């Protein structure tokens, strides 16, 4: 608090308040007894749960047939009207466009439209699979996805 | 007619203004204006001014008669209280209010 200990009574003799302080947390000034600050919110989670998840989640998309392996979905040039048609013609939307492969025009163009974001095989996580229902990967991507995970 | 009337920010003791609504509540006009000016209180000549203005709208704002106007509803609501202090004494002060009203006359049809 930016306050001080100055005491708003001179002990009993008067009965305005039993509080000795204006640095109380119950004051108009306030203070709050368990005030927020820097706190940690990061959990461990084992590497075998991590893999473990992306294996059950993998083998859940398969059972819900929504995992798509299509190749050469890389884009020749920045212009997202080419990355529109790539999904569209294959009647896809809500995609990840997840590959370990390097095409930078593909990372750049994926940033526009908020129903797709930049995803990589090496960058893989749960939440991104789960939300963005169609799941798009090259023959090379899957081969690498095996070693990375299991 | 139906016309309202307020004098807002009347400085005047409000329990006393309530007394003088009653005095002429529902007893026509043109003698209810006379009573106030020939009775007690300067609450009389404060609600009086509100009264003759209510009437004056019941004239000019439609009307043309004081012959068929009865002072149907007359009240007064508690108005914004004027905060002040009183040095009461011996190192004690108190918020002391200059209590107030919204004098409301509402003449209508007789």
């Amino acid at each position: 608090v930016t306050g001080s200990g100055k005491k708003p009574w001179r002990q009993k003799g008067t009965g305005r308040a039993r509080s000795g302080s204006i640095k109380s947390p119950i004051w108009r000034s306030g203070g709050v007894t368990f005030a927020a600050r820097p706190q940690d919110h990061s959990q461990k989670v084992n590497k075998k749960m991590y893999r473990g998840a992306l294996k059950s989640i993998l083998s859940e998309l398969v059972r819900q047939d929504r995992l798509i392996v299509v190749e050469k979905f890389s884009v020749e040039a920045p212009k997202t009207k080419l990355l529109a048609q790539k999904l569209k013609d294959m009647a896809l939307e809500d995609v990840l466009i997840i590959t370990g492969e390097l095409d930078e025009n593909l990372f750049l163009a994926a940033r526009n439209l908020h129903k797709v974001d930049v995803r990589d095989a090496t960058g893989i996580d749960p939440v991104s699979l789960i939300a963005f229902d169609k799941v798009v990967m090259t023959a090379d991507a899957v081969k690498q996805v095996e070693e990375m995970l299991a | 007619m139906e016309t309202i009337a307020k004098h807002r920010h009347a400085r005047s003791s409000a329990q006393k203004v309530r007394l003088v609504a009653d005095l002429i509540r529902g007893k026509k006009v043109s003698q209810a204006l006379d009573i106030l000016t020939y009775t007690n209180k300067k609450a009389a000549v404060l609600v009086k001014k509100v009264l003759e203005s209510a009437i004056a709208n019941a004239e000019h704002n439609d009307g043309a008669d004081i012959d068929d106007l009865k002072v149907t509803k007359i009240f007064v609501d508690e108005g914004p209280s004027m905060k002040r202090i009183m040095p009461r004494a011996k190192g004690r002060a108190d918020r002391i209010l200059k209590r107030t009203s919204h004098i409301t006359v509402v003449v209508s049809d007789r």
Binding site: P8, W9, R10, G13, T14, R16 | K83, I85, K90, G91, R92, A93, R95
Partner: peptide, 20 residues
Amino acid sequence: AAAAAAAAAAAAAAAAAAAA
């Protein structure tokens, strides 16, 4: 429309204990 109002904290005691 100015305002000034303090708080008071001074004693009203003057009377003395019964039966010590």
